[PDB]
């Protein structure tokens, strides 16, 4: 009979579990110290940092940096029942073409609901075990004026963690961060690193801007040291995990016999780039394949990447995959004429404007790209992918047009791309079905895009969408209205041989 994941049955559950189940043989509780705190316990936290932990754990015999979790609102309690009725422990369930594979994952020590003890979480993270603190919070969890590039301190989350009436009570990640802070000056330590692991470019340029600007409403001294002796490490993170699902957890006992109230589901693949800034120490990321590298600009080269390679791909399954009649990801890159159109696009188009990264082969990426994309069990909906284009098409796609506008180099798949939103805008595939176009913008794009024919001019005409490099290319406009026009007569499939080999 299946058994519940905790210390006690462990053992047992690694005897019944064959080659299907790895455990974690590392000891743990009172045989750790704790030095990672981090805030905002979820599925992008236990399927990739914690997974570099358990492996440092494992298969390195590091002891010191073991997890704390922090949740912060009354929703986590769920996910603290969960961890402690099973002394912390959780499985990641692996899935791919290979199969799916259990892996108990024991780097997570204990665990700190925010709202039954604030002072607890300011304490443990004040503690001088306490090495690095770990972000997952989300964009909206920073604060953050995107258009001014400030924080938003007028906002009354913000202004509540300000007053000093709440220096012991704070509730944000931010009031949090300070209140340790300050801590750890009275005791004459180090600040901790703070290591935002939230994907989203300048992860740690912006989380030290909030943090330091937080800080110089509170006390400007504090707020020099934290700028000065502080870390606020940029990294790029990568490793897909879809939310778990009742039917995960029953899936999980009948073919592994485990019993988890919350385990995490996960690609095989992952990626963690960050560059080596850290003010209190760190493990040794390098053993178990992280790339610590030397600065943001090194982060950016890695982030460019995956931005051009991933995202761009994205968008060349996305539009004309939908237009096609696909539901899913895996459909179209298992489509023999898309694999050869994305191949073709990501070698001929978008690798010659990419920078070359020691240690890195392009190649290699690309092949891994499709690979991840073709894994069936991930089970990515496009219309997720295309959610929110207007947003998209002009970060992952049109800065390879207007680069290769800038050297005259290729893009002829580019622009099949751009062309294929384009036509996608009008909501209608190419079998004649309606399907939604979720955009904020899509009473504008759907009126322009009606305005214009098989016709791209009313499109770029959207100055806040494209620039006048785009509207005053002959090569580019030549481009994209002959793909918009093939695409609107004959279709995706049809057009597609026309710019293959």
């Given at each position: 009979?299946?058994?519940?994941?905790?210390?006690?049955?462990?053992?047992?559950?690694a005897?019944?579990?064959?080659?299907?189940?790895?455990?974690?043989?590392?000891?743990?509780?009172?045989?750790?110290?704790?030095?990672?705190?981090?805030?905002?316990?979820?599925?992008?936290?236990?399927?990739?940092?914690?997974?570099?932990?358990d492996?440092?754990?494992?298969?390195?015999?590091?002891?010191?940096?073991?997890?704390c979790?922090?949740?912060?609102?009354?929703?986590?309690?769920?996910?603290?029942?969960?961890?402690?009725?099973?002394?912390?422990?959780?499985?990641?369930?692996?899935?791919?073409?290979?199969?799916?594979?259990?892996?108990?994952?024991?780097?997570?020590?204990s665990?700190?609901?925010?709202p039954?003890?604030?002072?607890?979480?300011?304490?443990?993270?004040?503690?001088?075990?306490?090495?690095?603190?770990?972000?997952?919070?989300?964009?909206?969890?920073?604060?953050?004026?995107?258009?001014?590039?400030?924080?938003?301190?007028?906002?009354?989350?913000i202004?509540?963690?300000?007053?000093?009436?709440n220096?012991?009570?704070?509730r944000?990640?931010?009031?949090?961060?300070?209140?340790?802070?300050?801590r750890?000056?009275?005791?004459?330590?180090?600040?901790?690193?703070?290591?935002?692991?939230?994907?989203?470019?300048?992860?740690?340029?912006?989380?030290?801007?909030?943090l330091?600007?937080?800080?110089?409403?509170?006390?400007?001294?504090?707020?020099?040291?934290?700028?000065?002796?502080?870390?606020?490490?940029?990294?790029?993170?990568?490793?897909?995990?879809?939310?778990?699902?009742?039917?995960?957890?029953?899936?999980?006992?009948?073919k592994?016999?485990?019993?988890?109230?919350?385990?995490?589901?996960?690609?095989?693949?992952?990626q963690?780039?960050?560059?080596?800034?850290f003010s209190?120490?760190?493990?040794?990321?390098?053993?178990?394949?992280?790339?610590?590298?030397?600065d943001?600009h090194?982060?950016?080269?890695?982030?460019?990447?995956?931005?051009?390679?991933?995202?761009?791909?994205?968008?060349?399954?996305?539009?004309?995959?939908?237009?096609?009649?696909?539901?899913?990801?895996?459909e179209?890159?298992?489509n023999?004429?898309?694999?050869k159109f994305?191949?073709?696009?990501?070698?001929?188009?978008?690798?010659?404007?990419?920078?070359?990264?020691?240690?890195?082969?392009?190649?290699?990426?690309?092949?891994?790209?499709?690979?991840?994309?073709?894994?069936?069990?991930?089970?990515?909906?496009?219309p997720?992918?295309?959610?929110?284009?207007?947003?998209?098409?002009?970060?992952?796609?049109?800065?390879?047009?207007?680069?290769?506008?800038?050297?005259?180099?290729?893009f002829?798949?580019?622009?099949?791309?751009?062309?294929?939103?384009?036509?996608?805008?009008?909501?209608?595939?190419?079998r004649?079905?309606?399907?939604?176009?979720?955009?904020?913008?899509?009473?504008?794009?759907?009126?322009?895009?009606?305005?214009?024919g098989?016709?791209?001019?009313?499109?770029?005409?959207?100055?806040?969408?494209?620039?006048?490099?785009?509207?005053?290319?002959?090569?580019?406009?030549?481009?994209?209205?002959?793909?918009?026009?093939?695409?609107a007569?004959?279709?995706?499939?049809?057009?597609?041989?026309?710019?293959?080999?």
């Amino acid at each position: 009979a299946p058994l519940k994941l905790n210390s006690r049955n462990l053992s047992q559950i690694a005897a019944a579990g064959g080659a299907l189940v790895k455990i974690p043989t590392y000891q743990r509780g009172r045989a750790v110290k704790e030095g990672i705190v981090h805030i905002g316990v979820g599925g992008f936290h236990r399927a990739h940092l914690a997974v570099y932990i358990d492996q440092l754990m494992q298969k390195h015999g590091v002891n010191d940096y073991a997890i704390c979790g922090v949740g912060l609102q009354p929703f986590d309690s769920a996910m603290r029942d969960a961890l402690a009725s099973q002394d912390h422990l959780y499985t990641l369930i692996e899935r791919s073409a290979k199969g799916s594979f259990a892996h108990v994952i024991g780097s997570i020590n204990s665990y700190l609901f925010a709202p039954d003890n604030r002072e607890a979480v300011i304490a443990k993270m004040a503690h001088p075990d306490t090495k690095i603190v770990s972000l997952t919070i989300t964009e909206s969890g920073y604060y953050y004026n995107e258009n001014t590039h400030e924080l938003q301190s007028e906002h009354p989350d913000i202004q509540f963690d300000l007053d000093p009436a709440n220096e012991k009570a704070p509730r944000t990640t931010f009031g949090f961060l300070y209140a340790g802070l300050t801590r750890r000056y009275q005791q004459g330590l180090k600040p901790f690193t703070v290591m935002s692991c939230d994907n989203m470019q300048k992860n740690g340029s912006i989380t030290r801007h909030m943090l330091e600007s937080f800080a110089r409403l509170r006390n400007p001294e504090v707020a020099e040291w934290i700028a000065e002796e502080g870390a606020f490490p940029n990294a790029m993170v990568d490793r897909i995990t879809p939310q778990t699902s009742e039917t995960d957890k029953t899936a999980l006992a009948e073919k592994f016999g485990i019993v988890d109230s919350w385990p995490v589901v996960t690609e095989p693949f992952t990626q963690w780039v960050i560059e080596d800034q850290f003010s209190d120490g760190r493990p040794p990321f390098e053993k178990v394949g992280v790339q610590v590298v030397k600065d943001v600009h090194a982060v950016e080269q890695f982030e460019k990447h995956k931005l051009r390679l991933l995202n761009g791909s994205h968008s060349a399954l996305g539009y004309p995959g939908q237009l096609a009649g696909f539901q899913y990801v895996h459909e179209v890159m298992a489509n023999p004429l898309f694999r050869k159109f994305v191949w073709q696009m990501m070698q001929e188009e978008v690798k010659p404007l990419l920078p070359e990264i020691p240690g890195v082969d392009i190649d290699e990426y690309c092949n891994t790209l499709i690979e991840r994309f073709t894994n069936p069990t991930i089970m990515d909906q496009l219309p997720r992918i295309c959610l929110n284009a207007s947003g998209k098409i002009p970060q992952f796609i049109m800065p390879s047009i207007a680069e290769a506008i800038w050297e005259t180099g290729p893009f002829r798949r580019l622009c099949f791309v751009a062309a294929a939103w384009f036509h996608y805008i009008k909501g209608v595939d190419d079998r004649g079905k309606p399907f939604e176009v979720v955009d904020p913008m899509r009473e504008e794009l759907q009126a322009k895009a009606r305005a214009g024919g098989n016709d791209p001019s009313e499109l770029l005409s959207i100055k806040s969408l494209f620039g006048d490099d785009l509207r005053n290319d002959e090569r580019f406009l030549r481009e994209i209205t002959t793909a918009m026009n093939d695409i609107a007569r004959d279709g995706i499939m049809k057009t597609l041989p026309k710019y293959i080999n």
